[PDB]
């Protein structure tokens, strides 16, 4: 193992010579320990409050889900809790039948997904120009010091050699050196993986049970047609701890996908997947007696959660997983076939050629979030193959039947549920939605220190848009929405995110009208929207029915909210008064 992760410690150890060590009482259990080294504490016990949306949010003062949210630990003291938790356990190794079906299904479903498209290599013009568009790593991109040493790891890659890509549990911290080694570790990732992602290989059209690129206003159609597919309950069982649960055998099953490269993109994927995803080399802070260390550990299994390749390969494992186990609820594998180091092919294979595309088609699949809808109920109770492969279900005992539900409208899918909504004009409309209380307490929370006024009315004024576009059927929403519109100023542009999710197509993002991009994302654009007459006022955008937004958290019919939703012209001015003379607009 020394082998092929030995240059990269020796790297780090001779770079922090001064005060490398090996720690005798390094908590790692699962995991290779190294050394330590010190460093200076990284993260914040509690996330910074963002004012403006906290002064037109006061019913939300005393709601129990706001606090919690504004309680994030990113300290070395939270990073080694999680780990703990977490990160340091191993995953039973699968049997040797359920190793050969997911063999035979990796393979089926690697030439499906790879039918018209082919892999590529993604290039410095490509990393540079997300780079840019997103957005120090806009500076180093620009830095030619920066790619030559992008050069030169490169070249160690086609040798079968890694020389500094390592992964961080935490966020950066001789400081530009350290800096360029990780995102340059990024790129070479970018450059060798990034086609699933660039080239929207996980698209629906793509790969049948894939929702890339498809976005957060189109998951609940999604939902919607696959609930018309006949058949069983639609499931959507959570798996504890995804990343931790992906087994060598995933990883040598993601690995295929080389066999379709060209052979100068085959030696860089093949360097990616065997130095950095095989083997790994990974740095996690740790609060000591003395002060805050550096760990250096290693594995040979699961997955680095903040890789370019890490929701594709996820993407592709979960669709394996679950036609896995729709074979298995189908009678296609029993226990004995799990069992059978000799399992015969050929009954795997016809399933796959003759009802594989058909069964991917009746799943809504994003990294380890999952809906399927299977022939019948079999599925409930076929957990041989879940439970071998180490997909092992969240708080519920092994052998425990998952439960399904018969409305899409009740099925939970990437942190939402959606509805469907009738229109004043008789159209139906299928809109994202959670517990209110999460979506107040997010735009709650400014990112970061050190945040003028201005910059955090601009994040207010995000999320504000972001309530407008995705979250306009929920009435509090619309109301502080309008309320935020309104106290930040018409011309300020909405800057930072509102958040990371791959579903976020960020159309709030924008100083154009709302109602005019509402119109485009709902009406104009929207395939599932047959009948493109635009609606010109918000009266005729509509909301959830009233008792649904209160079991959604809607404090409407509160006396609270009655004296709230009162006295907000009064708060909007307040904070009109406290950023100045300005140009505003009333949207109340
Ligand atoms: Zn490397
Ligand atoms: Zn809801």
Same mark, same amino acid.
């Given at each position: 193992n020394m082998d092929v992760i030995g240059e990269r410690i020796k790297r780090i150890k001779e770079e922090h010579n001064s005060t490398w060590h090996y720690d005798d009482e390094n908590p790692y259990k699962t995991w290779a320990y190294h050394g330590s080294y010190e460093v200076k504490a990284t993260g914040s016990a509690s996330s910074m409050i963002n004012g403006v949306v906290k002064l037109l949010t006061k019913p939300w003062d005393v709601v129990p889900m706001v606090t919690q949210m504004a309680m994030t630990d990113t300290t070395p003291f939270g990073q080694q809790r999680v780990f703990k938790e977490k990160v340091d356990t191993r995953t039973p190794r699968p049997l040797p039948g359920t190793r050969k079906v997911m063999e035979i299904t990796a393979e089926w479903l690697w030439r499906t997904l790879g039918r018209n498209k082919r892999p590529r290599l993604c290039t410095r013009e490509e990393f540079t120009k997300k780079v840019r568009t997103?957005?120090? $790593? @806009?500076?180093?991109?620009?830095?030619?010091? +920066?790619?030559?040493?992008?050069? #030169?790891?490169?070249?160690?890659?086609?040798?079968? @050699?890694?020389?500094?890509?390592?992964? !961080?549990?935490? =966020?950066? #911290?001789?400081?530009?050196?350290?800096?360029?080694?990780?995102?340059?570790?990024?790129?070479?990732? +970018?450059? $060798?993986?990034? +086609?699933? !992602?660039?080239?929207?290989?996980?698209?629906?059209?793509?790969?049948?049970?894939?929702?890339?690129?498809?976005?957060?206003? @189109?998951?609940?159609?999604?939902?919607?047609?696959?609930? @018309?597919?006949?058949? =069983?309950?639609?499931? $959507?069982?959570? %798996?504890?701890?995804?990343?931790?649960?992906? %087994?060598?055998?995933?990883?040598?099953?993601?690995?295929?996908?080389?066999?379709?490269?060209?052979?100068?993109?085959?030696?860089?994927?093949? $360097?990616?997947?065997?130095? %950095?995803?095989? !083997?790994?080399?990974?740095?996690?802070?740790?609060?000591?007696?003395?002060? %805050?260390?550096?760990?250096?550990?290693?594995?040979?299994?699961?997955? =680095?959660? =903040?890789q370019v390749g890490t929701y594709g390969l996820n993407t592709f494992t979960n669709m394996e997983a679950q036609l896995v186990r729709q074979m298995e609820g189908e009678g296609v594998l029993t226990k004995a076939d799990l069992e059978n180091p000799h399992l015969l092919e050929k009954k795997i294979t016809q399933w796959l050629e003759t009802k594989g595309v058909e069964r991917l088609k009746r799943m809504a699949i994003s990294g380890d979030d999952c809906v399927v809808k299977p022939i019948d109920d079999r599925f409930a109770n076929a957990l041989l193959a879940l439970n071998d492969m180490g997909k092992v279900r969240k708080d519920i005992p092994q052998w425990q039947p998952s439960k399904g539900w018969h409305d899409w409208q009740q099925v939970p899918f990437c942190s939402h549920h959606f509805h469907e909504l009738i229109m004043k004009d008789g159209r139906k409309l299928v809109v994202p939605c959670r517990p209110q209380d999460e979506l107040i307490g997010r735009a709650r929370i400014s990112q970061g220190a050190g945040w003028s006024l201005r910059e955090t009315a601009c994040l207010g004024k995000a999320y504000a848009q972001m309530w407008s576009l995705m979250y306009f059927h929920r009435r509090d929403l619309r109301l502080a929405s309008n309320a935020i519109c309104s106290a930040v100023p018409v011309h300020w542009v909405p800057t930072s995110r509102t958040t990371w999710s791959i579903h976020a197509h960020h159309q709030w993002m924008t100083t154009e009208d709302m109602l005019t991009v509402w119109n485009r994302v709902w009406i104009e654009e929207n395939p599932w929207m047959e009948d493109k007459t635009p609606v010109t006022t918000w009266e005729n955008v509509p909301y959830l029915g009233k008792r649904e937004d209160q079991w959604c958290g809607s404090l409407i019919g509160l006396t609270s909210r009655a004296t709230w939703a009162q006295n907000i012209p009064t708060a909007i001015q307040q904070v009109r008064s406290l950023i100045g003379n300005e140009e505003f607009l009333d949207y109340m």
């Open positions: 997103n957005a120090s $790593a @806009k500076a180093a991109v620009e830095d030619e010091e +920066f790619w030559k040493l992008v050069d #030169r790891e490169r070249e160690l890659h086609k040798l079968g @050699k890694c020389g500094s890509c390592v992964y !961080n549990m935490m =966020g950066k #911290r001789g400081s530009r050196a350290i800096w360029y080694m990780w995102l340059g570790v990024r790129y070479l990732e +970018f450059e $060798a993986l990034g +086609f699933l !992602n660039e080239d929207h290989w996980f698209s629906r059209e793509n790969s049948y049970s894939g929702v890339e690129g498809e976005g957060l206003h @189109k998951l609940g159609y999604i939902l919607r047609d696959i609930s @018309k597919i006949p058949g =069983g309950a639609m499931y $959507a069982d959570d %798996t504890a701890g995804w990343d931790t649960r992906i %087994t060598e055998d995933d990883l040598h099953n993601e690995e295929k996908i080389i066999q379709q490269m060209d052979p100068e993109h085959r030696q860089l994927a093949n $360097a990616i997947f065997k130095l %950095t995803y095989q !083997n790994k080399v990974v740095k996690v802070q740790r609060p000591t007696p003395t002060g %805050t260390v550096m760990d250096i550990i290693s594995r040979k299994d699961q997955r =680095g959660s =903040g």
